[PDB]
Ligand binder design. Structure first.
Ligand SMILES: CCc1cc(C(=O)NCCNC(=O)/C=C/C(=O)O)cc(Cl)c1Nc1ccccc1C(=O)O
Ligand SMILES: O=C(O)CNC(=O)C(=O)O
Ligand SMILES: [Fe+3]
Length: 432
């Protein structure tokens, strides 16, 4: 099973006892200035068509998200879920103009929600009482917001909530991934809008992980209400979104764990790899400074990282971002040139092996074979993922592109797309 709403007497007390880490600040606590600005920005972004269903992966299947979405946040920052790296439409941190102003708005919302979170965490530590301020400020330092939209009347059939009779679901039970440990989440909910929950009203539901005996909580969400998941709530509880009648937007502010997920990070990875390359001039004659297994391993790993975590993730989104911003165009051109050089590196390593003394040759194979086989496997999986039935139905605005890709002819490129043959020979040689 069952569930509790504010209609139930036990709700208040389940909340007080067992969800102290969940906070609700109702629309009343937020200036009607913000509301109009935030809500106008949602409706702007929608009109311009900045929100897209993402083509994700779940249990090995290609699925559009029920929800349309866009990521806004720090420049150069990314947020990865369900094996999809979302790139940030930049907000004006220190350091179009319609779209740009919405980004400014959601930044403004971000500052607001941050201050509320710090307060609530402060009050939460004070209750626990009956280093600390460092942790707290880091756990509220939102760097992105993932905006969301669903019009439920455009969906033919919505999933029933399976455990507690909560009715129709917009988003099923999950945790938010790729967040800093014990980091908070703050949500601004914008509804365009009795046995159990009102089906016409949107709700956020919560349950304890693993547990469908403890009745779940369904929190009504009216226009401009905010909720906060504090501390370890996101990890120890699941949440879902229960649809109502009308369309509904939301802004989900998060502290993305972006240690391997910023532009600066991956640029620096590329420069590390190219330290092994004689860099007098950019030509097709790539010569490497060392052939020590560990620097070659490292090089071929970085190559994989720029190729799959960045290039193919980016182009798989058919430059959807390009409608909103141009910010990533040059960086994705620079990463591609950096990756091209690396194809040059891999060719030079293959030249060196096919020249050594076997023992030296075999240390090299051993260092690189895992990276080359992953490269082959992930290229197949990405190529396919760009071909899927569902992918081919998207509009041209959003068609997956399989960049980088080249034909077996293309003599601009020194190695083939398909590495099967190359990988075969290398394994063979190791077994000599
Ligand atoms: C499963 C529900 C869901 C989860 C999340 C999410 O970010 N989760 C991060 C961790 N991973 C998991 O939750 C699960 C992984 C797995 O089972 O492989 C985000 C969305 Cl938007 C979403 N919703 C849907 C996505 C596509 C298709 C239908 C849905 C739906 O909700 O029915
Ligand atoms: O904001 C909401 O409650 C709906 N969206 C999400 O929960 C999400 O994006 O994971
Ligand atoms: Fe969520």
């Amino acid at each position: 099973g069952s569930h509790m709403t504010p209609k139930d007497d036990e709700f208040y007390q389940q909340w007080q006892l067992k969800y102290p880490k969940l906070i609700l600040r109702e629309a009343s606590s937020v200036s009607e200035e913000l509301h109009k600005e935030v809500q106008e920005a949602f409706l702007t972004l929608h009109k311009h068509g900045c929100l897209f269903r993402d083509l994700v992966r779940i249990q090995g299947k290609d699925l559009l998200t029920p929800v349309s979405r866009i990521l806004i946040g720090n420049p150069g920052c990314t947020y990865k879920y369900l094996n999809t790296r979302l790139f940030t439409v930049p907000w004006p941190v220190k350091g179009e103009a319609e779209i740009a102003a919405a980004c400014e708005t959601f930044l403004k919302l971000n500052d607001y929600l941050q201050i509320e979170t710090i307060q609530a965490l402060e009050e939460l530590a004070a209750k626990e009482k009956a280093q600390d301020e460092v942790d707290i400020k880091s756990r509220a330092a939102y760097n992105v917001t993932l905006l969301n939209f669903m019009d439920p009347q455009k969906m033919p059939y919505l999933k029933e909530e399976p455990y507690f009779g909560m009715g129709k679901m917009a988003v099923s039970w999950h945790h938010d991934e790729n967040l800093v440990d014990r980091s908070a989440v703050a949500v601004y909910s914008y509804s365009c809008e009795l046995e159990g929950r009102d089906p016409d009203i949107w709700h956020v539901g919560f349950k304890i992980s693993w547990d469908i005996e403890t009745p779940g909580l369904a929190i009504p969400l009216h226009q401009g209400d905010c909720y906060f998941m504090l501390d370890d709530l996101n990890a120890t509880h699941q949440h879902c979104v229960l649809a109502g009648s009308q369309p509904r937007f939301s802004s989900t502010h998060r502290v993305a764990e972006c240690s391997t997920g910023t532009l600066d990070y991956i640029l620096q990875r590329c420069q590390l790899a190219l330290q092994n390359v004689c860099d007098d001039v950019d030509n097709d004659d790539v010569s490497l400074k060392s052939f020590e297994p560990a620097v070659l391993k490292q090089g071929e790993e970085i190559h994989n990282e720029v190729e799959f975590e960045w290039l193919r993730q980016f182009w798989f989104q058919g430059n959807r971002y390009r409608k909103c911003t141009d910010w990533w165009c040059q960086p994705m051109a620079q990463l591609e040139a950096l990756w091209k050089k690396m194809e040059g590196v891999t060719n030079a390593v293959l030249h060196e092996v096919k020249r050594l003394p076997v023992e030296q040759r075999n240390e090299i194979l051993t260092a690189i074979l895992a990276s080359l086989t992953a490269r082959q496997n992930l290229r197949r999986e990405w190529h396919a993922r760009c071909q899927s039935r569902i992918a081919r139905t998207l509009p041209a605005d959003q068609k997956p592109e399989c960049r980088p890709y080249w034909e077996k002819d293309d003599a601009s490129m020194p190695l083939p797309f398909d590495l099967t043959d190359i990988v075969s020979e290398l394994r063979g040689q190791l077994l000599e």
